[PDB]
Design a protein around this ligand. Structure first.
Ligand SMILES: Nc1ncnc2c1ncn2[C@@H]1O[C@H](COP(=O)(O)OP(=O)(O)OP(=O)(O)O)[C@@H](O)[C@H]1O
Ligand SMILES: Nc1ncnc2c1ncn2[C@@H]1O[C@H](COP(=O)(O)OP(=O)(O)OP(=O)(O)O)[C@@H](O)[C@H]1O
Ligand SMILES: Nc1ncnc2c1ncn2[C@@H]1O[C@H](COP(=O)(O)OP(=O)(O)O)[C@@H](O)[C@H]1O
Ligand SMILES: [Mg+2]
Ligand SMILES: [Mg+2]
Ligand SMILES: [Mg+2]
Lengths: 395, 191, 234, 239, 405
């Protein structure tokens, strides 16, 4: 307390200093999206505002007299107008093709720069940019499943040399199916963490849209954007939202959604080659999927995430009880035997609830009795709401 | 509807004008009223009358997509109207069920759930008008949801005379019209 | 549901038969060992409350004086199978004046399994498989014999078979300890060692059952004093 | 005839109809049975006691025979069928073996009857659990409990119904040889067990007793109220 | 020609939002007023004196054109007026992007240096120069009307003390929505993440919404309340879109508690306004499956669900990992009924002839809602008769109104 008076004097002087420092340094405000003044190259911006002129985005439609020395280009300037223009002197004639987006000026509308194809911002955000914090070491009881998943979606990209030499075309699709909590998305999250190619996450509910032809359109732009990369991965979590089997119920039952599935089926295996995309589908209801989608060439590998066995459940218990402050003699083999048909999600809850019984008792170490009570609360007491009994019939 | 006027007054007028009466009594102020009866019995007439007499803004929520631009450009959930209701407090939010499941009764639940304890501003009452009370969802019929249910029976011989007297005042009537006989000539009729 | 009881999976599995097999993993662990000196049957009672009398939990059943059965899974379902076994036996004795072979007794009980149906069945016919695995053990002309039965009606002679919740763990331990030429005392001791390691509780003379069928001797239920003698070692 | 498999195996290996029947037991009134030295005791919570209800007709404690009686917990209509079926077999056993039925035998038959309804076409399982008490021919007190699956066990003291878990926890801690030394102490143990879930008190307690070489005796409310005062009196001196 | 190659990794904005910016002063430890804290604070003060002297010297000999007020005054000149509000379509390069004006016309413009490049994502609202349409700022999007509706601005006045009889129910909900925030050390020392989700189920009027009101009263996290019937939309895909947007707002306001009250109403109620039938509801359900436990990493978002019909829910929705705890809310017993009656009559002025014991057995299946409705109506009877004291006759006439008719 003898320094309480001296603390506030230097604290207030400090707070006055930051307020003083920010006065000369600047960076106050940001509501208009202003960068800190240390990054202001105002000399270049003034030149940029003059030397670099703005360019209107237009789409080339038809090239007239491409063979001759006077090739005229018809452009569609979005909602503005249509113009027959010629190329600029700084762009090669072979760099502009019909149907591609171009940048045109506001005076003579001459094409100045070819542009990337238009892609829905929603589809762009569907690509993964921060890899998840899940590795293959966090998945227990899925050894054989994981090798099959890696050798299709991870190995060919990592070491492509061992497939071209033998004339091998690796499978370009994997379907992960199993009851909820079995680890379908967990293994996919492990794939994204390890993969170095582009990973796109698609949820089947994201492909359901208000207007007619959107879900097919978003699939088209999804694969169009995936094809602009040397290697790509598309994850379709809960494909059964749009992957349901086609049917005719008199009325237009699920006609629009079926078209979205048909477009996805067309991109996977149609007239045109798909590219270097390896798709990954996860669903807890594989019985509802369309037969054409469940066909090799679209879903070549069908990896089943069945309920873990005794060895697998013991492995999952160790994974989730790795960081627990457990006792010395916790019989995890016994715990795995007390939940015969239990998902890995239940085992995680058992581990979490086991520490909850100890935290409730103000104990810093969870005994084996807490895990025994956790199994009764999770595996037994919560067995009324278990999704396993109904979903094993679907898988 | 003298009995109905008194019933709706203690539920919509007293909480707005005199919140201290309920605080002294130790009861929560009413927030949901249900007016049920045959069509044309005056449910909308009374609900509008209270809002006119207590200076409470009267908002009719028909669920029409024509008025959706005024409620808000979002239009995803019906509680977006609460922004306009708070700005005009005290407010009376009225939905009439013309009579799938009833959207008016669905809107009742969404508005009543917000008004339970999740609404900060007070003096926002809500009313439903329905033809029958036995068709209501069990969620609305649950005690504590609707604070008072007011019945609007078809006018009897004396009430029909009062209604006949009210509307005939807007006409050039010859002296000596026996409106009592005319009321007797309309058994089981609405207002 | 839409599915009937007699429905085949796309993999050729009878759905109700496989589901009844999963019921055994919820039952108590039973260990049976076949030895030239006799057949030993061990099972855990799984006491769930101190007030419950352990004597009432009969999971080893005298089928006859020369054959005994250990049960795991749904105990209530095994009563029908046990009663038929105790009726089929003493029916062979009535007609042939001899003790039925252990294989024949297991075969007769096995025929009861899969005799379940929904339509075109007798009023007394069963509706679902028997979710209990049986471990028949006894002595006959072929000497001591141990047979394992499953809800699928598949019976097979086993040198040392463990059924129940810890069947996977106990069977692996059984293979590490079983040799063809050993004594019954080792078989009893080894079964108790394996059981003690797999039980949730602590092994004592009141939460387990031990049965032996020796040649010459009859089916014998191990008492508490007899159980304490072998438990006191391990 | 209706020949349909009501009870079938779930993919996990569970008989859901059996489990659902056990859930109906957990909705019934709490029945408590304590097996003493020379007396066996059945205590049943009377749920809600309407003053206009004839307490004689609504009785969860019924006598299958002169030496065996049981208290149930679950669907009242389902139990009466089991009681009548057991009562008929009590007389059939008596005419054949010329000896009153043992507590094992009537418990075994009821449990076997329960299991038959979990494996028969067109029949749903019985949704009741029974607390069978009585005396054998050698005078040994016996208490048995059956569940809708068809399993039966002998218990020193057990509870079935909505408050079974709490009472059985209470019975695990208080059931000692001293606590069953006399008939009065055995009676008080049931009331202490019943009062753990019964809220109002002795008004919602229906207690019936059976002594060796004696018929089932239903305790009058004044006798129960007399006992409740003793536990209340004994509570003060222990504080 | 070759396509421009961006130097920034990815096309999304920086995840961090609303930081201390340049004022991220270090966490000096300990907080106790002792010498080394004074010593630590002095070092912070010293470097500021060094920083203050250095910055002043540079600006002193900086050209008159290059000044802190001059450069900011210049920045307005480059921005100009008015500042057109557009939409970012694609980030071609670090200083180049495609933007679209409100008229639907796209322009390939240059992003100026002074714009916060870390705030730029496709679909964001950008500020463009009126003449050259160059990106000259990012408009902080105002709070959406949908954001305001979910957010409970004022905490409800119902506390845990106003809940009677739900001791175990209150305790379980605290360890999943209250204890992890107030005392996160208990979980960290134990090595377990808190229980992920919680659902409150039971008969109507048992206190499911009341416990959430108590939770919202004593929480430091943002509380978002959504009724399950609000997730049924009039158009295809907006159901999944609303669920996706609801959990996006929760992620922005982290830590947050999302209360999906009456979750079963999404399926147990069928409306003709919902264009897609049960199939669109299933797609909405699958979207909610992804949000509760899916591919996307979840921040400090706690989910509370309430339903009086838990048997009608999809079991995959309430599976562990999504909803870890299933708290049951039983009908009140004798002890709880008396507590609820004392809770709702505490502010009342009861008469000497009114006994709560008789009112306990008004009905066998009596819930907390019935008890509160009995009291509220009983007071209304006294208000009709112009009285402040509630009599037994007032309560007697109360039971025949709420419980019967
Ligand atoms: N094999 C496993 N090993 C370790 N943890 C597992 C395993 N399987 C599941 N889990 C745990 O259970 C959780 C369940 O989520 P997960 O994404 O794996 O489910 P899912 O199989 O995709 O289910 P759903 O069909 O409902 O989408 C995981 O987040 C993880 O913590
Ligand atoms: N256990 C209780 N203790 C105190 N008050 C209670 C209790 N249960 C209910 N209440 C009162 O009942 C009122 C209405 O009930 P509430 O809104 O909590 O119902 P609920 O259990 O969420 O059911 P539902 O949404 O299915 O109708 C609450 O505002 C509260 O005052
Ligand atoms: N009791 C009444 N007294 C006077 N006018 C009435 C009465 N009931 C109905 N009306 C007349 O009927 C018209 C419409 O009635 P309305 O209140 O819309 O019926 P509802 O109650 O079914 O909504 C009103 O313009 C009103 O003048
Ligand atoms: Mg998943
Ligand atoms: Mg009308
Ligand atoms: Mg509610």
């Amino acid at each position: 307390s003898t320094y309480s008076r001296q603390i506030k004097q230097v604290e207030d002087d400090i707070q006055q200093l930051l307020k003083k420092i920010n006065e000369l340094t600047g960076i106050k405000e940001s509501d208009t999206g202003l960068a800190p003044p240390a990054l202001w190259d105002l000399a270049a911006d003034k030149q940029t505002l003059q030397s670099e002129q703005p360019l209107q985005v237009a789409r080339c439609t038809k090239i007239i007299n491409a063979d001759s020395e006077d090739p005229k280009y018809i452009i569609n300037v979005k909602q503005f107008a249509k113009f027959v223009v010629d190329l600029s002197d700084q762009v090669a004639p072979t760099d502009i093709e019909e149907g591609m987006r171009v940048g045109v000026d506001r005076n003579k509308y001459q094409i100045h720069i070819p542009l990337p194809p238009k892609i829905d911002p929603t589809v762009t955000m569907m690509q993964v940019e921060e890899k998840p914090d899940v590795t293959y070491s966090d998945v227990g009881g899925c050894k054989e499943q994981i090798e099959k998943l890696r050798e299709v979606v991870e190995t060919p990209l990592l070491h492509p040399e061992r497939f071209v030499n033998l004339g091998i075309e690796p499978p370009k699709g994997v379907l992960l199916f199993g009851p909820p909590g079995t680890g379908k998305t967990l293994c996919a999250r492990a794939v994204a963490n390890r993969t170095d190619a582009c990973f796109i996450r698609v949820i089947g509910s994201e492909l359901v849209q208000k207007y007619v032809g959107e879900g097919a359109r978003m699939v088209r732009e999804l694969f169009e954007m995936a094809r602009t990369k040397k290697a790509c991965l598309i994850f379709f979590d809960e494909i059964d939202a749009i992957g349901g089997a086609r049917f005719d119920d008199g009325a237009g039952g699920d006609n629009e959604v079926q078209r979205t599935m048909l477009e996805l089926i067309n991109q996977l295996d149609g007239f045109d080659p798909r590219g270097n995309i390896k798709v990954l589908m996860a669903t807890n209801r594989p019985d509802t999927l369309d037969p054409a989608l469940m066909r090799p060439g679209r879903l070549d590998r069908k990896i089943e995430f069945s309920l873990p066995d005794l060895e697998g459940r013991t492995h999952i218990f160790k994974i989730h009880a790795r960081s627990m402050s457990v006792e010395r003699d916790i019989r995890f083999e016994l715990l795995a035997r007390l939940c015969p048909n239990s998902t890995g999600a239940e085992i995680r809850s058992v581990c979490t609830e086991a520490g909850m019984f100890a935290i409730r008792a103000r104990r810093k170490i969870a005994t084996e009795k807490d895990f025994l009570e956790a199994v009764n609360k999770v595996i037994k007491s919560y067995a009324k709401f278990s999704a396993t009994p109904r979903y094993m019939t679907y898988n | 509807l003298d009995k109905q006027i008194k019933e709706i007054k203690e539920v919509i007028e007293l909480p707005v004008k005199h919140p201290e009466l309920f605080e002294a009594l130790g009861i929560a102020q009413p927030k949901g009223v249900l007016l049920y009866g045959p069509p044309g019995t005056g449910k909308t007439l009374l609900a509008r009358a209270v809002a006119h007499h207590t200076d409470c803004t009267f908002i009719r929520v028909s669920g029409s997509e024509l008025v959706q631009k005024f409620i808000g450009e979002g239009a995803r959930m019906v509680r977006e109207l609460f922004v306009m209701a708070r700005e005009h407090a005290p407010s009376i939010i009225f939905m009439d069920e013309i009579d799938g499941d009833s959207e008016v009764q669905r809107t009742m639940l969404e508005l009543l759930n917000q008004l339970d304890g999740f609404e900060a501003t007070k003096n926002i009452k809500v009313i439903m008008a329905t033809n029958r009370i036995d068709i209501l969802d069990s969620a609305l019929l649950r005690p504590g949801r609707i604070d008072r249910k007011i019945e609007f029976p078809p006018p009897n011989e004396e009430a029909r005379l009062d209604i006949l007297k009210i509307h005939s005042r807007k006409m050039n009537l010859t002296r000596g019209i026996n409106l009592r006989k005319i009321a007797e000539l309309m058994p089981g009729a609405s207002g | 549901y839409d599915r009937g009881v007699n429905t085949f999976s796309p993999e050729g599995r009878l759905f109700q038969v496989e589901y009844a097999i999963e019921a055994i993993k919820l039952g108590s662990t039973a260990i049976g060992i076949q030895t030239s000196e006799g057949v030993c049957l061990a099972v855990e009672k799984r006491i769930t409350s101190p007030l419950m009398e352990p004597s009432s939990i009969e999971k080893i059943v005298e089928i006859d004086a020369h054959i005994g059965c250990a049960m795991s899974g749904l105990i209530a379902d095994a009563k029908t199978l046990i009663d038929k076994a105790r009726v089929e036996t003493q029916n062979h004795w009535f007609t042939y004046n001899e003790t039925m072979t252990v294989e024949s007794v297991t075969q007769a009980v096995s025929n009861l399994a899969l005799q379940f149906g929904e339509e075109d069945a007798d009023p007394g016919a069963m509706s679902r498989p028997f979710g209990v695995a049986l471990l028949f053990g006894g002595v006959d002309e072929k000497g001591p014999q141990l047979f394992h039965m499953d809800p699928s009606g598949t019976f097979v002679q086993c040198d040392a078979r463990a059924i129940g919740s810890a069947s996977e763990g106990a069977q692996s331990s059984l293979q590490e300890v079983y040799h063809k030429s050993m004594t019954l005392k080792e078989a009893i001791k080894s079964s108790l060692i394996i059981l003690k390691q797999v039980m949730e509780e602590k092994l004592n003379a009141t939460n387990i059952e031990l049965a032996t069928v020796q040649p010459g001797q009859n089916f014998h239920m191990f008492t508490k004093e007899e159980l304490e003698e072998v438990i006191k070692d391990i | 005839s209706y020949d349909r498999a009501i009870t079938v195996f779930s993919p996990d290996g569970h008989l859901f109809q059996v489990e659902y029947a056990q859930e109906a037991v957990k909705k019934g009134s709490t029945a408590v049975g304590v097996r003493g030295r020379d007396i066996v005791v059945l205590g049943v919570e009377k749920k809600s006691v309407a003053k206009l209800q004839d307490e004689r007709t609504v009785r969860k404690i019924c006598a299958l025979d002169d030496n065996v009686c049981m208290a149930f917990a679950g669907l009242t209509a389902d139990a009466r069928i089991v009681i009548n079926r057991a009562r008929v077999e009590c007389q059939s056993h008596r005419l054949t073996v010329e000896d009153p039925v043992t507590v094992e035998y009537i418990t075994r038959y009821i449990a076997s009857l329960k299991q038959r309804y979990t494996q028969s076409n067109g029949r749903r399982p019985f949704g009741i659990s029974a607390l069978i008490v009585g005396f054998d021919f050698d005078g040994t007190p016996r208490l048995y409990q059956t569940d809708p699956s068809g399993t039966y066990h002998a218990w020193k003291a057990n509870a079935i119904g909505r408050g079974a878990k709490s009472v059985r926890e209470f019975l695990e801690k208080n059931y000692t040889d001293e606590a069953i030394e006399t008939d009065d102490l055995t009676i008080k143990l049931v009331i202490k067990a019943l009062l753990e879930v019964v809220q109002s008190g002795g008004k919602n307690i229906e207690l019936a007793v059976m002594r060796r070489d004696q018929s089932l005796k239903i305790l009058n409310p004044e006798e129960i109220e007399k006992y409740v005062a003793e536990i209340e009196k004994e509570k003060e001196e222990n504080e | 020609y070759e396509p421009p190659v961006p130097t920034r990794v990815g096309k999304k904005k920086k995840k961090t939002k609303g930081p201390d910016a340049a004022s991220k002063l270090p966490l000096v430890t300990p907080h106790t007023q002792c010498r080394l804290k004074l010593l630590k604070l002095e070092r912070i003060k010293d470097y500021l004196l060094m920083e203050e002297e250095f910055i002043r010297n540079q600006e002193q000999m900086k050209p008159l054109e290059e000044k802190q007020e001059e450069e900011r005054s210049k920045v307005d000149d480059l921005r100009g007026t008015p500042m057109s509000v557009g939409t970012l379509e694609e980030i071609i390069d670090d200083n180049h992007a495609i933007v679209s004006t409100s008229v639907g016309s796209e322009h390939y413009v240059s992003i100026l240096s002074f714009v916060d490049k870390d705030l730029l994502e496709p679909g964001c609202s950008v500020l463009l120069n009126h003449k050259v349409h160059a990106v000259i700022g990012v408009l902080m999007d105002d709070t959406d009307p949908l954001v305001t509706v979910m957010k409970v601005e004022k905490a409800p006045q119902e506390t845990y003390a106003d809940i009677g009889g739900l001791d175990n129910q209150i305790q379980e909900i605290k360890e999943s929505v209250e204890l992890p925030l107030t005392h996160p050390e208990y979980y960290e020392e134990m090595g377990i993440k808190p229980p992920k989700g919680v659902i409150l189920y039971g008969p109507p009027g048992t206190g499911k919404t009341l416990l959430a009101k108590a939770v919202a009263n004593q929480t430091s996290a943002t509380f978002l309340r959504v009724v399950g019937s609000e997730l049924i939309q009039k158009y295809l895909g907006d159901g999944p879109k609303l669920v996706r947007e609801l959990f996006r707002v929760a992620e922005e306001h982290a830590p947050s508690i999302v209360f999906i009250d009456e979750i079963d109403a999404i399926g147990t109620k069928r409306y003709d306004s919902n264009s897609g039938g049960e199939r669109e509801i299933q797609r909405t359900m699958l979207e909610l499956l992804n949000q509760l436990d899916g591919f996307d990493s979840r921040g400090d978002v706690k989910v509370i669900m309430a339903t009086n019909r838990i048997e009608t829910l999809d079991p995959a929705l309430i599976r562990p990992g999504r909803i870890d705890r299933k708290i049951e809310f039983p009908l009140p017993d004798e002890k709880t009924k008396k507590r609820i009656f004392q809770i709702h009559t505490s502010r009342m002025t009861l008469a000497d002839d009114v006994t709560l014991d008789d009112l306990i057995m008004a009905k066998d299946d009596l819930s907390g809602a019935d008890i509160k409705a009995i009291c509220t109506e009983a007071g209304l009877m006294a208000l009709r008769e112009r009285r402040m004291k509630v009599t037994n006759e007032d309560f007697k006439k109360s039971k025949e109104n709420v419980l019967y008719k």
